[PDB]
Design an enzyme around this catalytic site. Structure first.
Site, short mmCIF file in Angstrom:
data_model
loop_
_atom_site.label_atom_id
_atom_site.label_comp_id
_atom_site.label_asym_id
_atom_site.label_seq_id
_atom_site.Cartn_x
_atom_site.Cartn_y
_atom_site.Cartn_z
N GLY A 11 41.95 -8.83 15.78
CA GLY A 11 40.95 -7.85 15.39
C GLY A 11 40.65 -6.91 16.55
O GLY A 11 41.49 -6.68 17.41
N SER A 40 46.53 -12.81 18.52
CA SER A 40 45.89 -11.69 19.22
C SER A 40 44.58 -12.20 19.83
O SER A 40 44.61 -13.19 20.58
CB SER A 40 45.76 -10.51 18.27
OG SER A 40 45.30 -9.35 18.95
N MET A 41 43.43 -11.58 19.53
CA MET A 41 42.16 -12.02 20.10
C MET A 41 41.79 -13.43 19.68
O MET A 41 40.97 -14.07 20.35
CB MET A 41 41.05 -11.05 19.71
CG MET A 41 41.27 -9.64 20.21
SD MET A 41 41.54 -9.53 21.98
CE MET A 41 39.97 -10.14 22.61
N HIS A 51 50.89 -12.15 21.90
CA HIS A 51 51.32 -10.76 21.89
C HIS A 51 50.33 -9.90 21.11
O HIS A 51 49.82 -10.30 20.06
CB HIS A 51 52.72 -10.66 21.27
CG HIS A 51 53.16 -9.27 20.95
ND1 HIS A 51 52.95 -8.68 19.73
CD2 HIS A 51 53.84 -8.36 21.70
CE1 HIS A 51 53.46 -7.46 19.73
NE2 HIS A 51 54.00 -7.24 20.92
N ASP A 55 57.24 -10.33 20.95
CA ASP A 55 56.66 -10.42 19.61
C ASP A 55 57.11 -11.72 18.95
O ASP A 55 58.11 -11.76 18.23
CB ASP A 55 57.05 -9.21 18.78
CG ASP A 55 56.19 -9.05 17.53
OD1 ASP A 55 55.44 -9.99 17.19
OD2 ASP A 55 56.27 -7.98 16.89
#
Ligand SMILES: O=C(NCc1ccc2c(c1)OCO2)c1nnc(Cc2ccc(F)cc2Cl)o1
Ligand SMILES: O=C(NCc1ccc2c(c1)OCO2)c1nnc(Cc2ccc(F)cc2Cl)o1
Ligand SMILES: O=C(NCc1ccc2c(c1)OCO2)c1nnc(Cc2ccc(F)cc2Cl)o1
Ligand SMILES: O=C(NCc1ccc2c(c1)OCO2)c1nnc(Cc2ccc(F)cc2Cl)o1
Ligand SMILES: O=C(NCc1ccc2c(c1)OCO2)c1nnc(Cc2ccc(F)cc2Cl)o1
Ligand SMILES: O=C(NCc1ccc2c(c1)OCO2)c1nnc(Cc2ccc(F)cc2Cl)o1
Ligand SMILES: O=C(NCc1ccc2c(c1)OCO2)c1nnc(Cc2ccc(F)cc2Cl)o1
Ligand SMILES: O=C(NCc1ccc2c(c1)OCO2)c1nnc(Cc2ccc(F)cc2Cl)o1
Ligand SMILES: O=C(NCc1ccc2c(c1)OCO2)c1nnc(Cc2ccc(F)cc2Cl)o1
Ligand SMILES: O=C(NCc1ccc2c(c1)OCO2)c1nnc(Cc2ccc(F)cc2Cl)o1
Lengths: 166, 166, 166, 167, 167, 164, 166, 166, 169, 165
Positions: free
Chosen positions: H51, H80-81, H105, H145
């Site tokens: 996000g 992510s976060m 990533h 990725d």
């Protein structure tokens, strides 16, 4: 001057994108046209389609068989669903494919349950006729959500030659 | 006439913008046309694309290998995803790029899981074929979400000449 | 004929409105065209743009530097973001502007964090190259969300002459 | 031929509807075109616009002043915001208006900071004062009123010169 | 050839549909053209409009008055709001209407202030009274009624001169 | 409380409107609920549906057969497609219908699976109407509605009631 | 009372409709709740789902295995894609199905090619563990675009008992 | 209410994408539970694909500020976060279920080029702090990725325990 | 009940999210609530906003200054545009920020205004910033011109906030 | 709800645009507070850019109708009908915060006469409460501009500009 006109002057019919009644009308019109110029000179059909409407596809299929011209089919990019059916419908010995193309025969108005099976069995027979495989094999193959390589589709009976250079 | 009708008269094919089945049809039609005019005169392919559909890119790629003409590839602006494949697929010694361009080889009807991997390995081999690198190098580079400079991409084997002026 | 088709007969290329991959393709074709008629007669580039895609602008920029023709740039209305870069990229002594124009060099497919930062420094060097200013000045100037007057931008090295009448 | 080509063959430039970068490009192209055909024969600019983008209007304004041709402005229907600025920018003695036309000088692409909008506003103030020969304080106070002027009213103000019912 | 092209070869200008700045530009452009072909040969204006923009209608009106050609107006289907104003603006003795047409003079760019809507309304009041030869008291009281008039009714009022079933 | 809850307090389950996975969840939950209070007291199912999702209807059908309670089915307004299947799936002798209702058994994934569902519906109808497979297949082929008396003469419902 | 506040009082967790991150949180919360009331009393999971997000299904699966309670799974209507995985993940001997229910194990945030295969192999192992079949069988079975009958799924190892009446 | 009882057991759910709306709710529950007991631990269940960074850093700063021990649980996925919040748990209390997917990533208002690197470099330091790896290792890993298995993330330093059963 | 009804019982007002006339109304209502209950106990304002409507922000600002309570401001996540103004408007010595926050005072380029009335608002913002950061007007004008974010230590050295805390001592 | 406690302190919030929906609620709260006491004052918080004229005149007449004293407070901005409600407070009880913006220019489908009839109705209402002439109000309302709280106090729209109590 449209490039697709100088393609027609070379007896090349492009079946690219999805297949609906609009696409079939053009392809059939182009096929009947080239036959008038010569019912003996061969016709090249380039195929890059993921499929489409069955009746629209069967319309092109019967038209390919109706005319007297030989039909060279070329699978470019991919030929899935009804697109592979048109690919296998080429004149025996004239069904080609490029090396990195992908072939799929699995199937992804409003009709009844008995009607879709009528068309499905109708597709079984057309495949078995041009690939010379058994009906039981076609049923098992079309049941698998999978793509075939150009060499795989040659072993299955869908196309005849895989060409890197002419 | 139209500027795009004059580029064709100068053997220039524009592969700019995203790549779908619609773009590939034009490029392939333009490629087959220029070959008919001369199977010896080279063809110029300008590339400014962020990628697109894989099968459509492989369609252009197989056509680039099919025809006999030498093909000069030019990366202008950017050539990412399938765009870099078309750039590296040029005739060896004729793969160019402008100084401020960016090259990316990382990859960003649906298909099954086993099918997308059949395409990635299909991309691995095509890159390794034209960059003369090992499969491990191509795989390891494509794992990084990153862009390359023309000099970076030249050492890697994607392009041959970086020109500011001729 | 078309008023824009008569402009081309006078070696005038219009870079108005936002800049995308579509704009760059058209402009590059017109630039390559005018060069073929004469690599010595200058080319006029009228700019009224608020910016656009960076890669698309750099595509035009590399083409502007690539060709041999001198390029007269005219700032009409406004030249912001990538628009000022093409304005400053003109042949030295041929970068013009009308009196009430506004010039802006501050900057307002998805990329990674390092790559957009790779692009700003790519913009820093091109600006510093054509305005003959130091990198510290360009970096500090692009930090200000502000427009410059035509004479102010002349003081900075973006354009050379401000004309009210010829 | 196309009527707008027949207008162009008679040195008439139509500035109708809102003004954006798309309109300005055509008008500038048509003005540069007519100058090439003759830098001495006058050019007629028909205006029926409620305004538009400021930078696009200033592009036409700077182009009108740049060329050597005399420019006859004709206000038909209405000329508001940038439209009246293009109207007043005609050659002195060649700024016309039809009797039922509407003139407005009060102001109602990319975003802008506060200082830039006041930069543009003072840039509009100076252009009006130059062509109407009025003082800047008068222009500022007049542009403060959300109001339209009659064709005869604007003639006393310096925006146009002649109000014509018949030629 | 386009039927709208052949229409021009017979000096017919079609004002049909709503009236905006785009429609006015065409009508004004075609009117200026026919004057060049002949500043004496009459011009035919076929009207089937429900109204439109006031300033756009006044643009056509002032242009009709500006040129020297006689103008035959024809009410076909309906002519309401600004459409009826252009109908009455024809050359006296050349304002026609078909039997089943309907004429309405009651009223339904940028956002206008209250004083500006009255200035346009009073501008419409005077134009009707001039061409209908009626008093302001009649025009205002009539325009207050949300109603349509028959072709014979509108002839008794001064909007048109002839009601024809056959020529 | 809610009027539909006082219906539930009287062992009434409303299947009205099209059938989706959401409708089946409520009906199944309400059916399992009433069984716990009493596996012997019957359950009343009011049906006014033009059909819906097949799997959701079979979910309701299998639950109707699973539970031990007798099921009184009521066709009010109409019972078409999957609605008529739920109507005929009531306890024999307890399948009702109002006089002005209309019953439809004609039916408006892969081909081999759409056919597997159709043949699956054939058997459910034939089981509860005690008719032949050819009769059910031939009847379901006609795009038409049946009157409440017709559906009784077919085996879909048992009684047509004007007043209680 | 509300029926959904009453299913929980009978240790019934409803997995009906598609599976997304929102459903998993509800299902996981209710599963964690019932364990606190009793780590020994079994939990009943009714499944009528066409599938959904893979990560959301694995969230429920790991939670079903994590907790100590026995889990009775009931296939009502259908259990396809991730739904069949949750059905087979029940406590051995407690995986049920109603007679007309249909079971499908073929599988119909963006990811990379190498990562979708990891999830597929992750699905292969979970299926093979609970059905006691070979990985080679599971791969070929999941390749068929088809549904299974309750008796078929009882033989394949997905469920244990097919009940018409208790 | 199940969401009222989750809080009654000191469980905070971070599921779905992360925005300022999620952060405000999570922060409020975290500040709430600290007042109830600055010693009793808090359990954070995470099922997020990432996000907005500032919202994630908002939760991160709040997680570190309070005195309570924080048990983090990766359920479904943490990308992510989400993985940053996962590694931000109290050392020795960072868990994950076996079939979870961990990704580090990176894929409110528009930001300038220099201000995305400051956020990126801000993420590097937080990862290196909580994973106990070097910045050079973290940076090279975040460029790929790809997803990691719970055991991979256990070896990398993101979480401490991988549990199938307690 | 609602978790937001439990922050209120602890004198915490959340200015999280964009600022419009709707957000300001709650904050103004919540601020007057806590002052009437007690004009001496401080009020805590948690800020995670990218900005919003200027007049709506000034409504909160004027209300923050009007009441008698000291106001503790907390920059969490980000405080940009009008958010930093409310952040810097806290009682001196009570303006906090967490370590990874981002403070922005540059204004990004409920009714439509005129050109002269936007400068009346910017100068209105200039004076409030210079008042609470105790910098010169020329610095504030030049600082707000840079499209940039500040770190909590950067924003502290500028005068926007007073303390940067990782944990409470 | 915080807005329910606001009513318990005789505070009515007029924030956001004004339509027939807002006016009905505000009037109900005003009619409510009069029933509680026709002597205790009512506080009207205004943060509005304007709205429908008929809805504003509905609120205005109700403010004049009731017997309670009405304290108006301009917070944020008061434009179009918002400034009318601001000046409609009991004289000596019309306040404003320092950074508020007051605007008196007026930026179903009605006819020209009825639209001109509404403006003159606004002219008279302003002149009545600001104790200015119609000529002054017309010329002031013609300028598309905002006024400062002290400017509007010199004009007669509000009485006090407060920084602190
Ligand atoms: O005369 C016929 N062809 C000659 C021909 C000549 C020039 C053409 C052309 C066709 O097409 C454009 O240029 C003809 N008439 N009927 C048929 C049978 C038929 C077969 C398939 C189909 F889809 C539709 C039909 Cl009608 O053939
Ligand atoms: O080159 C061929 N004809 C000459 C020619 C072709 C197109 C033209 C042209 C001249 O002038 C203007 O357009 C040719 N022979 N077979 C094919 C079918 C085909 C289609 C697509 C593809 F990718 C590969 C193949 Cl092989 O084409
Ligand atoms: O002969 C060349 N031009 C002459 C020319 C003639 C007529 C034209 C034209 C161009 O354009 C329309 O009409 C040429 N030389 N190199 C290239 C490849 C290339 C180079 C840079 C670039 F940005 C894009 C490309 Cl494709 O082309
Ligand atoms: O070349 C010019 N005239 C000849 C001409 C001939 C045919 C045309 C034309 C122009 O335009 C249509 O067809 C010319 N006149 N002034 C300038 C400077 C200038 C100013 C503003 C601007 F936006 C662009 C420019 Cl180049 O150039
Ligand atoms: O009689 C005229 N012959 C010139 C002419 C000839 C052919 C045309 C044409 C014009 O237009 C296309 O074909 C004429 N032209 N313009 C005017 C004055 C005028 C009147 C109204 C208005 F809105 C603008 C203007 Cl400039 O007079
Ligand atoms: O626990 C059962 N009843 C208790 C109960 C009590 C109150 C209820 C309720 C249920 O529902 C709301 O209120 C039960 N009886 N049979 C089964 C097996 C079964 C069969 C079909 C199906 F779709 C789901 C299941 Cl679990 O479980
Ligand atoms: O309190 C816990 N159990 C008791 C409990 C009681 C009532 C509940 C509840 C949970 O939930 C609703 O009502 C607990 N604490 N940690 C865990 C590990 C865990 C495992 C999987 C997962 F997805 C998330 C977590 Cl946190 O369980
Ligand atoms: O006064 C406080 N009492 C504790 C408390 C807080 C919230 C509550 C609660 C009890 O019960 C329900 O909700 C308080 N706690 N923290 C702060 C300042 C702060 C604000 C925002 C932020 F992100 C971090 C911090 Cl540290 O103040
Ligand atoms: O009556 C006041 N307090 C009592 C009160 C009690 C409980 C509350 C409350 C208010 O709010 C919810 O819970 C009051 N104090 N100052 C003012 C003037 C003012 C200033 C700014 C503004 F926006 C609005 C106003 Cl009215 O009024
Ligand atoms: O107090 C009055 N009734 C009791 C009452 C009590 C509490 C209320 C309320 C009303 O409303 C919600 O809370 C009252 N006073 N005058 C009127 C007539 C009237 C006046 C103005 C208007 F717009 C509409 C009407 Cl009907 O009624």
């Amino acid at each position: 001057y449209d490039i697709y006109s100088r393609l027609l002057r070379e007896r090349i019919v492009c079946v690219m994108g999805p297949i609906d009644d609009s696409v079939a009308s053009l392809v059939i019109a182009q096929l009947l046209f080239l036959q008038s110029e010569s019912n003996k000179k061969p016709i090249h059909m380039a195929i890059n389609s993921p499929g489409g409407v069955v009746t629209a596809g069967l319309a092109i299929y019967d038209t390919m068989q109706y005319i007297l011209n030989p039909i060279c089919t070329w699978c470019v990019g991919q030929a899935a669903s009804m697109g592979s059916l048109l690919l296998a419908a080429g004149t025996p010995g004239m069904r080609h494919s490029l090396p990195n193309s992908r072939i799929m025969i699995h199937q992804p108005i409003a009709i009844q349950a008995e009607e879709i099976m009528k068309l499905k069995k109708q597709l079984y027979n057309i495949y078995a006729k041009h690939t010379k495989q058994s009906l039981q094999v076609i049923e098992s193959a079309m049941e698998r959500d999978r793509y075939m390589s150009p060499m795989e589709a040659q072993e299955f009976g869908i196309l005849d030659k895989v060409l890197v250079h002419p």
